[PDB]
Design a protein around this ligand. Structure first.
Ligand SMILES: [Zn+2]
Ligand SMILES: [Zn+2]
Ligand SMILES: [Zn+2]
Ligand SMILES: [Zn+2]
Lengths: 744, 307
């Protein structure tokens, strides 16, 4: 079968032994040898038919001297080489002759002597079997000749000994010494069809038979120490790894899977690990390790198709608190750095997020990114605070609107509108103040909202709200005033002006269809409001492309009591289950509010805002719950991991000033050893200026009078900091404790 | 979603694994040459080794780290069927505390326990029993009481448990398998320690996994309402349990990724349990981040060398 060889002294040349001998050359990229490399064939030879073995003359120059054995027993020295600069030109063409004619099986040059070639020939009645030639001066004069009436099948020079040859005969497995040929060491085994000596250990030899592989050593040489599994198909090639220690490459006939075996623990058990790799999806003829490159392979199919691979695995991962994982691959480790939620909380913490004692809404801007959930919660929390201060100036707001509007009395349904708040009962103004329609105060006009919106640049939100207060000459005015900037709204101003309220007026039929072709969804609720057939409030209230705050107000002003409770209750259940931060406007900071924030944590793992929000003036009925106290602990433990210790302290200052029920305790105590109120004894003095404990006399840390918890030897806080800068021993003589360096 | 840079480290033989410290400073490596190392990063960002020695007459492949609330501790699994529990003494002398040679067959895994039950080692050994070691009196580290074992009746491959320190969660153990005989059954079974019975009884069984699992890694709780598993049998099968005497947990497989098509090496969750830094046999090891629709889709790839 065809075989593939490399160039011993070249990193970019390999030859394929086949029906003809072909030399290739590896070229770069950017015959497809690899997905990132390809072949560049240079030379062809076909002079010798019926080739039975190929071997390479491992010297620094000639570059491609190849030794080829034939079926007649004659080894022929042939070269492919390069532009000849002949240094030993006589050698090429020097075919050898055995004195009979048989098959030639194995060939091997001498790694150290570099000039002795060994040939193995099949059996003959009365002639030598193994012949040791000497290609130095058609020379049929063997320098040695061994094995009368026998047939060799494998050959390999031992690495350590300068002149020793290991050979595999038919049933003899002999190691021959080439100083006296009368003697030899031998065993009688069946694994003789191939002999290898591993490079590093150079004392363990591997040999194979049929489908079983045997392992020997040269120090015991009695019985096979290790064996392998009876694979149900014959083997074809076995070769150790010449760069990675421990790998028995293996091949079987008519297959495509190579098996690589791991042997680290070279009497108990054998350490055997096997992993199989398929370089390609076609059948495999033979392979070839690499002498220089890191753990390499090339394979050739029975067709001309070449290929390549590599040999390494079993990587391991280690993570880090700053979210940057570690590689591990043999002699190489790599680290990768940088939206992830963990990464965000780092910048939020470094920006003092959620720590304002001022305009509270300044937290959504402090968060950096723009998100509707956050840019609404802090608006919701700010409004509840301004009411609590205003009411205090003259707490149930924290319940949420669902509990506020349970007792909503009155609820007289309005008749047909009269286009042109204080008549609502106080429970409804409670919902209006939180939403932001009006300000803290009995101002019935929604002007403050209207005039703050125009200067904010939002024009539609100044129209939807305005005519929701029944102002259709201010309706055009909002669109007229904005129309000078930016521009279709002027035409909409005409359309949004007239409406007939008839039963089959042309405006109603046209508008219901002309709504859905527009983009901004406020204009949808615009047309869907005018055409609402006297109570069909099913389009405006459910277009969830609009902010919930408006929908809370608009449903409150119009819908009656029997209609309001069903709507508000059904919205929270969707709000809670889907985990929406906007539900705090409805649910509040009650037991339900804790339930909703479970879903928000469940889907995004945000413990920073879930911690700060529940701390906001909640009572001693949901702040003592197990769930909320778990989030607090995890955030504190997370901060300690990032080594942001001073930031954790500032958070506990805030927690201390808001929840006294989680106060810390004392850890220091004075326990006099004598009884000192009883023994009338003073505490010890410092070891440098010797003044006693307590006597008087920014830089006020200096006289802090620190201590040591192992050696029971203290002193003045600053005196030893000056002393410890040049030494590493306790000031007190007859004590061998290094106080500061013991911590590290 | 990363830039890959190779660290400047040199280990003699082929590396086995890297553990990591708590604050994110010091790792621990291995080799098939019986060697360990700890590299403390300098304030400038450079890495320098500080200790090394010989471990055992075999290979050590599962070195691990401990928590600073107990000082400094390490452990490892090797051929000697023992755990090398070596502490630091301060140039530092890294020798203290005895071995834990109590396993007749080879040890498979070695890991520590969450920091809310004190020190509790655990080791599962090859052909059978899993084993937990505890020591109350942490003033000298040479005492170690077993007091608890199990019988998995299979070749254990990997161990894990959830750092969930909630007062409402019973501690649980997840075990891997390695049997690949021409039959199918179970490869990952979940345990749960009791209080009155004081026994780790068997509760669940993932009856959809049959391939030779290689690693198991819980996701840190951080405050979720349910746990998360992670297997590497054939495809990064991220499971999800939810409690509803055993705790009957409804299973919901939310992950099946063919990308490796391999004998995937290892799986390791992050600090906050969102990104699944997975690995495999063939090549580059990817990530599996999260999406707005709770969708697990690969969001990064980095190759074993200079990529
Ligand atoms: Zn006293
Ligand atoms: Zn002292
Ligand atoms: Zn002093
Ligand atoms: Zn001291």
């Amino acid at each position: 079968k065809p075989d593939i060889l490399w160039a011993p002294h070249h990193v970019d040349r390999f030859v394929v032994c086949d029906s003809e001998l072909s030399l290739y050359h590896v070229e770069s990229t950017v015959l497809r040898l690899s997905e990132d490399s390809a072949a560049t064939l240079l030379s062809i030879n076909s002079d010798t038919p019926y080739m039975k073995c190929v071997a390479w003359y491992l010297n620094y120059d000639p570059e491609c001297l190849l030794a080829v054995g034939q079926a007649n027993g004659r080894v022929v020295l042939t070269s492919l080489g390069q532009d000849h600069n002949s240094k030993f030109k006589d050698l090429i063409g020097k075919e050898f002759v055995p004195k009979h004619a048989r098959q030639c099986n194995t060939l091997a040059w001498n790694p150290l002597d570099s000039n002795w070639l060994a040939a193995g020939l099949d059996k003959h009645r009365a002639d030598f079997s193994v012949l040791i030639w000497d290609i130095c001066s058609l020379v049929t004069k063997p320098l040695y000749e061994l094995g009368q009436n026998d047939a060799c099948l494998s050959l390999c020079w031992l690495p350590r000994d300068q002149k020793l040859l290991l050979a595999g005969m038919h049933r003899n497995l002999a190691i021959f010494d080439l100083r006296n040929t009368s003697q030899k060491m031998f065993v009688n085994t069946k694994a003789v069809q191939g002999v290898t000596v591993d490079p590093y250990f150079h004392d363990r030899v591997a040999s194979f038979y049929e489908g079983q592989v045997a392992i020997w050593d040269l120090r015991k040489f009695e019985k096979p120490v290790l064996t392998l599994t009876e694979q149900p198909k014959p083997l074809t090639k076995v070769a150790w790894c010449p760069t990675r220690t421990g790998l028995l490459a293996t091949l079987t006939r008519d297959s495509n899977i190579i098996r690589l075996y791991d042997m680290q623990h070279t009497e108990t058990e054998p350490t055997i690990i096997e992993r199989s790799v398929q370089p390609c999806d076609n059948y495999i003829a033979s392979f070839a390790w690499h002498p220089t490159s890191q753990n390499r392979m090339i394979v050739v199919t029975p067709n001309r198709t070449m290929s390549d691979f590599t040999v390494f695995e079993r990587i391991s991962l280690a993570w880090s608190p700053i979210t940057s994982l570690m590689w591990a691959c043999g002699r190489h480790l790599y680290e990768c750095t940088e939206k992830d939620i963990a990464t965000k909380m780092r910048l939020r913490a470094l920006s003092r997020y959620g720590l304002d004692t001022e305009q509270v809404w300044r937290n959504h801007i402090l968060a950096g990114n723009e998100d509707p959930q956050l840019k609404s919660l802090w608006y919701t929390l700010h409004f509840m605070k301004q009411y609590t201060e205003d009411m205090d100036q003259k707490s149930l707001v924290y319940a949420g609107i669902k509990s506020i509007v349970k007792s909503s009395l009155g609820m007289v349904e309005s008749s047909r509108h009269n286009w042109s708040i204080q008549n609502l009962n106080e429970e409804r103004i409670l919902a209006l103040q939180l939403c932001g329609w009006i300000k803290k105060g009995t101002d019935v006009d929604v002007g403050p909202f209207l005039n703050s919106l125009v200067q904010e640049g939002e024009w539609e939100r100044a129209a939807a709200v305005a005519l929701f207060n029944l102002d259709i000459r201010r309706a055009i005015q909002i669109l007229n005033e904005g129309a000078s900037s930016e521009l279709n709204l002027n035409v909409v101003a005409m359309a949004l002006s007239g409406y007939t309220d008839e039963k089959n007026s042309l405006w109603r039929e046209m508008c219901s269809t002309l709504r859905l072709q527009l983009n901004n969804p406020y204009l949808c609720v615009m047309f869907a409001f005018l055409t609402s057939e006297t109570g069909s409030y099913d389009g405006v209230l459910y277009e969830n492309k609009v902010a919930v705050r408006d929908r809370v107000a608009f449903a409150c002003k119009f819908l009656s009591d029997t209609q309001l409770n069903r709507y508000i209750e059904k919205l929270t259940n969707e709000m809670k289950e889907a985990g929406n931060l906007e539900g705090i406007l409805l649910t509040g900071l009650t037991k339900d509010g804790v339930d909703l924030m479970e879903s928000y944590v469940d889907r995004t793992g945000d413990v920073q805002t879930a911690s700060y929000c529940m701390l906001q003036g909640s009572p001693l009925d949901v702040l003592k719950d197990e769930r909320v106290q778990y989030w607090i602990e995890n955030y504190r433990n997370l901060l300690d991991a990032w080594r942001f210790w001073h930031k954790r302290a500032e958070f506990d200052i805030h927690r201390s000033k808001l929840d006294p029920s989680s106060k810390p305790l004392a850890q220091v105590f004075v326990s006099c050893n004598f009884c000192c109120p009883g023994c009338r004894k003073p505490l010890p003095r410092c070891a440098l200026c010797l003044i006693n404990m307590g006597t008087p006399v920014l830089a006020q840390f200096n006289n802090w009078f620190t201590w040591c918890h192992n050696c029971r030897h203290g002193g003045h806080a600053g005196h030893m900091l000056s002393w410890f800068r040049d030494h590493a021993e306790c000031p007190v003589s007859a004590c061998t404790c290094k106080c500061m360096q013991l911590d590290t | 979603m990363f830039v890959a840079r190779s660290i400047a480290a040199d280990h003699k033989d082929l590396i086995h694994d890297v553990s990591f410290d708590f604050h994110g400073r010091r790792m621990a490596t291995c080799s098939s040459d019986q060697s360990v190392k700890v590299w403390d990063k300098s304030e400038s960002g450079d890495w320098h080794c500080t200790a090394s020695w010989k471990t055992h007459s075999g290979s050590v492949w599962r070195v691990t780290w401990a928590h600073p609330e107990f000082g400094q501790v390490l452990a490892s699994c090797s051929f000697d069927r023992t755990a090398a529990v070596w502490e630091e003494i301060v140039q530092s002398h890294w020798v203290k505390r005895t071995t834990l040679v109590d396993s007749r067959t080879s040890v498979t895994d070695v890991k520590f326990a969450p920091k809310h039950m004190g020190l509790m080692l655990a080791t599962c050994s090859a052909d059978g029993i899993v084993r937990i070691y505890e020591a109350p009196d942490v003033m000298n580290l040479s005492q170690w009481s077993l007091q608890h074992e199990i019988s998995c009746k299979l070749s254990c491959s990997c161990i894990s448990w959830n750092p969930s320190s909630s007062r409402a969660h019973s501690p649980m153990i997840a075990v891997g398998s390695d049997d690949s005989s021409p039959n199918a059954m179970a490869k990952v079974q979940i345990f749960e320690y009791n209080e009155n019975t004081r026994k780790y009884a068997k509760a669940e069984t993932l009856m959809t996994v049959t391939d030779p699992v290689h690693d198991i890694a819980f996701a840190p709780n951080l405050g979720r309402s349910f746990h998360i598993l992670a297997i590497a049998t054939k495809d990064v099968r991220i499971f999800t349990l939810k409690p509803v005497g055993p705790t009957k947990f409804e299973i919901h497989i939310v992950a099946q990724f063919d990308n490796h098509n391999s004998q995937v090496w290892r799986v390791s969750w992050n600090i906050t349990g969102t990104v699944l830094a997975s690995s495999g046999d063939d090549g580059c090891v990817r990530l599996w981040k999260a999406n707005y629709m709770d969708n697990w889709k690969c969001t990064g790839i980095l190759k074993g060398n200079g990529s």
